[PDB]
Ligand binder design. Structure first.
Ligand SMILES: *CCC1=C(C)C(=O)N[C@H]1Cc1[nH]c(/C=C2\N=C(C[C@H]3NC(=O)C(CC)=C3C)C(C)=C2CCC(=O)O)c(CCC(=O)O)c1C
Ligand SMILES: *CCC1=C(C)C(=O)N[C@H]1Cc1[nH]c(/C=C2\N=C(C[C@H]3NC(=O)C(CC)=C3C)C(C)=C2CCC(=O)O)c(CCC(=O)O)c1C
Ligand SMILES: *[C@@H](C)C1=C(C)C(=O)N[C@H]1Cc1[nH]c(/C=C2\N=C(C[C@H]3NC(=O)C(CC)=C3C)C(C)=C2CCC(=O)O)c(CCC(=O)O)c1C
Ligand SMILES: C=CC1=C(C)[C@@H](Cc2[nH]c(/C=C3N=C(/C=C4\NC(=O)[C@H](C)[C@H]4CC)C(C)=C\3CCC(=O)O)c(CCC(=O)O)c2C)NC1=O
Ligand SMILES: C=CC1=C(C)[C@@H](Cc2[nH]c(/C=C3N=C(/C=C4\NC(=O)[C@H](C)[C@H]4CC)C(C)=C\3CCC(=O)O)c(CCC(=O)O)c2C)NC1=O
Ligand SMILES: C=CC1=C(C)[C@@H](Cc2[nH]c(/C=C3N=C(/C=C4\NC(=O)[C@H](C)[C@H]4CC)C(C)=C\3CCC(=O)O)c(CCC(=O)O)c2C)NC1=O
Ligand SMILES: C=CC1=C(C)[C@@H](Cc2[nH]c(/C=C3N=C(/C=C4\NC(=O)[C@H](C)[C@H]4CC)C(C)=C\3CCC(=O)O)c(CCC(=O)O)c2C)NC1=O
Ligand SMILES: C=CC1=C(C)[C@@H](Cc2[nH]c(/C=C3N=C(/C=C4\NC(=O)[C@H](C)[C@H]4CC)C(C)=C\3CCC(=O)O)c(CCC(=O)O)c2C)NC1=O
Ligand SMILES: C=CC1=C(C)[C@@H](Cc2[nH]c(/C=C3N=C(/C=C4\NC(=O)[C@H](C)[C@H]4CC)C(C)=C\3CCC(=O)O)c(CCC(=O)O)c2C)NC1=O
Ligand SMILES: C=CC1=C(C)[C@@H](Cc2[nH]c(/C=C3N=C(/C=C4\NC(=O)[C@H](C)[C@H]4CC)C(C)=C\3CCC(=O)O)c(CCC(=O)O)c2C)NC1=O
Ligand SMILES: C=CC1=C(C)[C@@H](Cc2[nH]c(/C=C3N=C(/C=C4\NC(=O)[C@H](C)[C@H]4CC)C(C)=C\3CCC(=O)O)c(CCC(=O)O)c2C)NC1=O
Ligand SMILES: CCC1=C(C)/C(=C\C2=NC(=C\c3[nH]c(C[C@H]4NC(=O)C(C)=C4CC)c(C)c3CCC(=O)O)/C(CCC(=O)O)=C2C)NC1=O
Ligand SMILES: CCC1=C(C)[C@@H](CC2=N/C(=C\c3[nH]c(C[C@@H]4NC(=O)C(C)=C4CC)c(C)c3CCC(=O)O)C(CCC(=O)O)=C2C)NC1=O
Ligand SMILES: CCC1=C(C)[C@@H](CC2=N/C(=C\c3[nH]c(C[C@@H]4NC(=O)C(C)=C4CC)c(C)c3CCC(=O)O)C(CCC(=O)O)=C2C)NC1=O
Lengths: 177, 277, 164, 164, 177, 164, 177
């Protein structure tokens, strides 16, 4: 579990030298950014439930074979396990948004997920499809371009940050496959 | 001045001030210091005492029950320092996956402590003497400790459970590396629970996945989640857990017997099934 | 590492919750205290050499018996080691100063230091003489800002109060 | 209660450390975010009556079938029960808003609400109609300060995202 | 475990009404105080080891019966148990200083300590004397009038806070007896 | 206490067995080694005073900086304390020597000594100078019997190797 | 668990001085005794099971209410628990014989036994009767005057030891009542 600060520190410790102005300058870009990341995490964590519902319902909508008998979503038990999985994934994505580094997402959620789904016969393509939908929904909330709910916030540039969150979803979607 | 009631519950003053006639020894054993306990939040401290007594005020041994509580909660703190050492919470103490789970966890643990109190006297005597004997074997000739285990019933039980948690030598924190250790480990656990209950009828307490309706499924889910976190562990953690489980289960259940000493050192997950408690 | 955001994310992970406004206010306090202690980090990366030099020179100025021939530091290589050790300590103060918290310092320097220092006949009072020398030579206005300096004081005191 | 300073003290207490600089910055962020939330708390204690009244009136404006004689809310006493329950909700939003975090609200309002509402044939979507009515009727500059408003938005959203 | 905030909230919840404007004013005295409390906690937690050592050493200094054989300080084991007890006491006091309420100290440490010392034969008078020495040393550090170490702080009035800390130590000293 | 008969009875108690011939042979070795250790115990109770006196005098003969005004032992009362501390140590060597094993010494002297000595700025090398002084001043034939002397050496070495 | 040795040491530690000659002389009587105690423990530990069988059978013989329905010894399970209790009693008594002090017997077995039997309804007078029969049988084996088994030993006086073992059985029988 390492934030962007601990990432700076760890890299300088492997280099075995002091911190210094260059790395600190990039870190002052992070700290100077600040409330854009705060508000972003507030947006995704606010509408989290609804993201998970829509994403997984869309995932069932593209291929109805999951709800077909013999599909992995055919029961209430398997549907429940499905919903909690999407929820946990979005949870750890938000953790990786506050941290600024993907260490918590790599250690706490990603470490042994591929093996697990393969052992349980979960189709990985359908999971990457749901991670993609959560990506689009999460970027749309994070840019406040969501077509249902549009709350007042200071207007500036928040594209970088969108690219960060897209990086995290692409990490998960790349990992599950 | 006060009441008849409250003067039963109160306290005793000094021989020079509060009472003239010099009180005898029995009145210190019968009235004295009167404090009833808190409702207890773990199965390890649940069946040892009274918790309260409406219309009775005991004295001088309630000092001891209060002392066992405070030493026992002092026990839990340290074995929880082991899982949270660097002030950041490790994956050991996560306590949920979904957002609403932890309260249901709290209630399951609580009523499990109440069912631990409902099980009869002969069984709880059995577990007191068993755990006492077990703490004396883990005392390692420390004489202070041995006094403080012959007297404490709660500190023994949380001492065992607590050390089984912080050593990590648990049945659920160790995953076997083979199919042979799967079947061996499974068989050992079965034989432990069959040694506990030969009646063939489930006994109040024990496993007990179901209290209210819709409990069993959450039990299944929390179990599988803890299996996944047990799966994700590092090299250091795994190797430390295996040495610890092999040694500990040898010290408790292998008595210079080369067969079982061999089948503990050979397969550590069987030992971790042998740890029980 | 122990820090603000790792304590809050670790507590939300141990609780199994989404990160609420409490963690947001915690990282708010992190991003508000940040600039001060990073300034102190800049100046520590500035003149660490003279810090280590005056630290070790005053350390043997207090304890002369170390260069006597019992006690350990009685060879040029081990005085190089004592200096090397103090350089590691100031580098850990820089690291934990950048991080925020004592986590980098605690897990690299403090954890298990008792058995090593007790084993290799190393007295702690020499280290404490070094750190208290640096803390007395510190400054209020001239080199640093006062506020950030307080952060530096805290970290250095933590080292002393983790040593003896 | 889950809050900033209780999370940090709780983390230090569980770990058994003295309170390091990380907790100090966390409570620094608490004391910086505090005024914005407190002011929103003042205004909520101001006009809670009209908040509950418009909330429930718009709630039955969306769902008429509740006052039909199947479904629960079909008598004057149970429509009274509607308004007092929404009143409970706004008071918990005030509590949690003052504390900082969701600890007061979560442990009093959310924990085990699913069994009660599911048992007594209470739809969650009627509550969510009420809260989303209040969240859409909210405001940016007119009643509140923008910043504080955000804190209120968060709390209300939290209730919705804890409810369904 | 309850801070200032939670204490006000609990009292308003028993009263069953909204927190209101008035309580919030006393809470604005807390928030408006702020970094006085921060710097104060930093002072006590800075010199904490040294406080524990001096207080227990002073306690042995007033009556050398403790280090006399049969005394409760007579051995290395009992001495160590003595010092860890002083340390944990100081620890919870500092917790109560950041919290603003004594709830953490009442629940986590105070609840059953008396009976414990009674059952171990710890002399309670000597413990209240050690709590008193830690009180005096801690107030002297918190006011920065300590005779050995005197660090730079921007000046002001910090008597209130010292009275709070004195209140916490008098709670412990009243509790151990 | 850790001893022969307490190890065997403790092992039989942990095992839940009757005491077989193995424990009988163990206590046979106890009652055969007993005379050598007991004789050493007699002579230690004979001249413990001069043992402590030469021990501490040679201890400050090696380390002079202790009576300098930094380091601890710079006052008459604390030199009295260093002397009493070494008298406790020789008494524990006499106790453990009479018991058989290191149990008496380990649970009174060694257990928890690290916190105390590390706390109160007490260097171990002064103790080791004292004990190694006694062990080098010891003797082969003139005061004691050789074999019992070896027992004494072992116990004193145990103290050294439990200290640093 | 304290033997003869640790009893001498603890008493000298309360006295706070060196062990001394007088206590060492009594200890030389113990060690000089030695293999009489070894051969004594060998005798009782040899015939132990048979002592327990005979003593419990005699105990059922004096009052047949035990084996009467509603008696404690009614059924196999209670009889098995009876036999293992007599066996463990004799086991700790033999531990007290090798130890030379009753500390093992006071700490490991005696501490909370009367309360236990009162909580289970075990008749205490019958237990003291069983301890009395184990006392007489154990003294008769320890003097090698048993009417069934008489093994060859080098002759001499074992009378002093027999008083010790009788003192331990009187401690157990006094404790159970
Ligand atoms: C160790 C306790 C124990 C012994 C001994 C034993 O024989 N079996 C258990 C108690 C037991 N448990 C059940 C019933 C259920 N137990 C679960 C929980 C598991 N199922 C899962 O999927 C998982 C996660 C992978 C766990 C932990 C469940 C879901 C049930 C069935 C619930 C229901 O609605 O019926 C029983 C009764 C069944 C039986 O074994 O006869 C017993 C005795
Ligand atoms: C190393 C800790 C420390 C620093 C640094 C410092 O400047 N002084 C101490 C803390 C300190 N101690 C007190 C107060 C008292 N300390 C003692 C204990 C000593 N007095 C003795 O007689 C002995 C034995 C010889 C010892 C160990 C006492 C008795 C007091 C006064 C108690 C009272 O009731 O007031 C103080 C406060 C005074 C000050 O120095 O300003 C401080 C900061
Ligand atoms: C594992 C041993 C843990 C260590 C070490 C530690 O410091 N605390 C443990 C992990 C931990 N648990 C929580 C949060 C909650 N834990 C709950 C369960 C208990 N509450 C109960 O009432 C009962 C039954 C009596 C139990 C077993 C509950 C509930 C919570 C709060 C849930 C919530 O919604 O917030 C935490 C986080 C809180 C903290 O200690 O900082 C941690 C780290
Ligand atoms: C985890 C849950 C849990 C409980 C609920 C209790 C239940 C409980 N109570 C007692 C024991 C007791 N409980 C009471 C209480 C009573 N006094 C009266 O006048 C009333 C009838 C009643 C209070 C309403 C008394 C008096 C005893 C002691 C009984 C005795 O020794 O005679 C015991 C036996 C052990 C002991 O002596 O403490 C147990 C298991 N214990 C637990 O571990
Ligand atoms: C040679 C003699 C000798 C002793 C006497 C012991 C004494 C001793 N105990 C502990 C350590 C310990 N001792 C206890 C015991 C306690 N649990 C409680 O609830 C009670 C208060 C108490 C029993 C009465 C516990 C719980 C620990 C571990 C403490 C922790 O890690 O938090 C340690 C530190 C090393 C370790 O973790 O094992 C030592 C030296 N060790 C020795 O070598
Ligand atoms: C897969 C690996 C595997 C093992 C290694 C064993 C280990 C093991 N042994 C026992 C159980 C047992 N093991 C022994 C063995 C012993 N008798 C003695 O005199 C010696 C000390 C020791 C042989 C050297 C005895 C006697 C029991 C029964 C104990 C009792 O009921 O009192 C039990 C409890 C269940 C049972 O009663 O069988 C288990 C799990 N079982 C397994 O499944
Ligand atoms: C990451 C942080 C970090 C540290 C802080 C150091 C700490 C440290 N120092 C030494 C080791 C050493 N440290 C010193 C230093 C001392 N000489 C003296 O005269 C003084 C008492 C003192 C300087 C103030 C010496 C002399 C040794 C070698 C000791 C020996 O071999 O006898 C060792 C053992 C390995 C080695 O030999 O290098 C370690 C771990 N190492 C680390 O990795
Ligand atoms: C601390 C917070 C807190 C709350 C938020 C409430 C929540 C709550 N409401 C009810 C109970 C109720 N709540 C309502 C309310 C409703 N009527 C309708 O037409 C609508 C759907 C809805 C208002 C929007 C009704 C009608 C009942 C009674 C239900 C019944 O008895 O059928 C109950 C069960 C106990 C009771 O009967 O009062 C509880 C716990 N209570 C609390 O303690
Ligand atoms: C994260 C860690 C952290 C801290 C440790 C504090 C440190 C701190 N203290 C003050 C500021 C201050 N600190 C004190 C404290 C006192 N003055 C006295 O003379 C007494 C000795 C002592 C009693 C406690 C005072 C009086 C002020 C100035 C008044 C005030 O700002 O309220 C300030 C204001 C800014 C400045 O002065 O530059 C800050 C940041 N705040 C933090 O965020
Ligand atoms: C049962 C065994 C047993 C011991 C072995 C001692 C060990 C011991 N010594 C001290 C305490 C002390 N011990 C010394 C001794 C020293 N002075 C020096 O110059 C030398 C380095 C050293 C003698 C060789 C001193 C000076 C103190 C007081 C330290 C201080 O207060 O600064 C203390 C703390 C309590 C006290 O102040 O007395 C303890 C537990 N005590 C015991 O109960
Ligand atoms: C390792 C196992 C082990 C044992 C079991 C004992 C066995 C043992 N007993 C004696 C020796 C003896 N044993 C007894 C014992 C008694 N005689 C009586 O007539 C009584 C019936 C009985 C009471 C206990 C006596 C009296 C002696 C001789 C006197 C003595 O040696 O003190 C001797 C001396 C050597 C010899 O006789 O050849 C030995 C080795 N010692 C051991 O090392
Ligand atoms: C100091 C004790 C300690 C504990 C208790 C700990 C972790 C821990 N184990 C826990 C649970 C938990 N751990 C165990 C462990 C266990 N099972 C065994 O057979 C043995 C011998 C065990 C001891 C290691 C059980 C039975 C449970 C109850 C089942 C359940 O609740 O899922 C909990 C509670 C919440 C959760 O389920 O995660 C926690 C917080 N880490 C520790 O250090
Ligand atoms: C008929 C089967 C079916 C569905 C079910 C949907 C599911 C769906 N939602 C999307 C994407 C999507 N979904 C939402 C969330 C959603 N919108 C909101 O404004 C609110 C309040 C929401 C929760 C209630 C958002 C915010 C987006 C991003 C697009 C947008 O701006 O609306 C996308 C686009 C995916 C992509 O970009 O790759 C799909 C496929 N589509 C289907 O064909
Ligand atoms: C009818 C119900 C009944 C019994 C059952 C017995 C039980 C019994 N055994 C005794 C005593 C006793 N028991 C034995 C042990 C026993 N004898 C042996 O030689 C061997 C090999 C034994 C185990 C198989 C010995 C050795 C003695 C001592 C007397 C003797 O020398 O035989 C005594 C005398 C107690 C005393 O002295 O106070 C009694 C009462 N008596 C009864 O009335």
């Amino acid at each position: 579990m390492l934030d962007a600060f601990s990432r700076v520190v760890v890299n300088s410790d492997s280099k075995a030298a002091y911190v210094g102005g260059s790395d600190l300058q990039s870190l002052k870009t992070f700290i100077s950014d600040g409330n854009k990341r705060l508000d972003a995490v507030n947006c995704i964590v606010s509408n989290a439930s609804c993201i998970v519902s829509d994403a997984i319902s869309g995932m069932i909508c593209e291929n109805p074979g999951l709800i077909a008998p013999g599909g992995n979503c055919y029961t209430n038990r398997r549907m429940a396990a499905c919903l909690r999985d999407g929820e946990i994934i979005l949870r750890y994505v938000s953790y990786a948004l506050l941290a600024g580094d993907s260490s918590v997402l790599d250690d706490r959620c990603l470490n042994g997920l591929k093996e697990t789904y393969i052992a349980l016969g979960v189709p990985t393509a359908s999971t990457s499809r749901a991670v993609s939908i959560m990506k689009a929904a999460s970027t749309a909330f994070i840019m406040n371009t969501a077509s249902g709910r549009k709350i007042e916030i200071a207007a500036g540039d928040c594209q970088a940050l969108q690219s960060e969150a897209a990086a995290y979803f692409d990490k998960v979607g790349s990992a599950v496959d | 001045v006060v009441d008849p009631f409250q003067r039963k519950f109160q306290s005793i003053g000094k021989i020079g001030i509060d009472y003239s006639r010099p009180k005898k020894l029995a009145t210190y054993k019968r009235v004295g210091y009167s404090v009833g306990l808190d409702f207890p939040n773990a199965v390890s401290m649940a069946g040892h005492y009274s918790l309260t007594d409406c219309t009775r005020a005991g004295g001088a041994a309630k000092i001891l029950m209060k002392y066992d509580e405070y030493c026992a909660k002092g026990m839990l703190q340290v074995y929880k320092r082991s899982a949270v050492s660097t002030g950041v919470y490790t994956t050991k103490c996560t306590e949920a996956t979904q957002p609403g789970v932890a309260y249901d966890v709290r209630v399951f643990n609580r009523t499990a402590a109440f069912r631990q109190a409902q099980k009869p006297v002969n069984v709880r005597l059995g577990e007191q003497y068993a755990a006492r004997k077990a703490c004396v074997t883990l005392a390692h000739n420390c004489s202070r400790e041995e006094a403080q285990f012959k007297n404490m019933p709660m500190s023994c039980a949380t001492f065992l459970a607590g050390k089984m948690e912080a050593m990590g030598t648990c049945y659920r924190t160790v995953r076997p590396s083979s199919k042979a250790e799967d079947y061996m480990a499974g068989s050992v656990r079965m034989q432990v629970y069959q040694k506990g209950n030969a009646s063939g009828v489930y006994p109040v307490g024990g496993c007990e996945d179901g209290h209210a309706k819709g409990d069993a499924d959450l039990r299944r889910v929390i179990a599988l989640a803890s299996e996944y976190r047990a799966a994700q562990q590092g090299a250091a953690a795994v190797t430390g857990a295996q040495y610890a489980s092999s040694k500990m289960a040898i010290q408790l259940y292998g008595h210079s017997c080369n067969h079982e000493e061999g089948q503990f050192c050979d397969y550590p997950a069987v030992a971790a099934a042998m740890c029980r408690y | 590492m122990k820090s603000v955001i790792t304590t809050t994310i670790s507590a939300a992970d141990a609780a199994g919750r989404f990160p609420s406004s409490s963690d947001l206010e915690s990282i708010q306090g992190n991003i508000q205290r940040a600039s001060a202690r990073l300034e102190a980090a800049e100046k520590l990366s500035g003149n660490h050499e003279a810090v280590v030099k005056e630290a070790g020179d005053a350390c043997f100025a207090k304890y002369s018996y170390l260069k006597n021939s019992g006690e350990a530091g009685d060879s040029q290589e081990k005085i190089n080691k004592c200096y090397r050790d103090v350089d590691h300590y100031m580098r850990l103060i820089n690291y934990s100063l950048v991080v925020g918290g004592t986590g980098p310092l605690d897990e690299w320097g403090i954890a298990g230091s008792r058995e090593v220092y007790r084993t290799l006949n190393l007295p702690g009072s020499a280290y404490i003489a070094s750190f208290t020398f640096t803390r007395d030579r510190l400054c209020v206005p001239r080199d640093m800002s006062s506020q950030a300096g307080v952060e530096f004081v805290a970290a250095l005191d933590y080292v002393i109060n983790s040593l003896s």
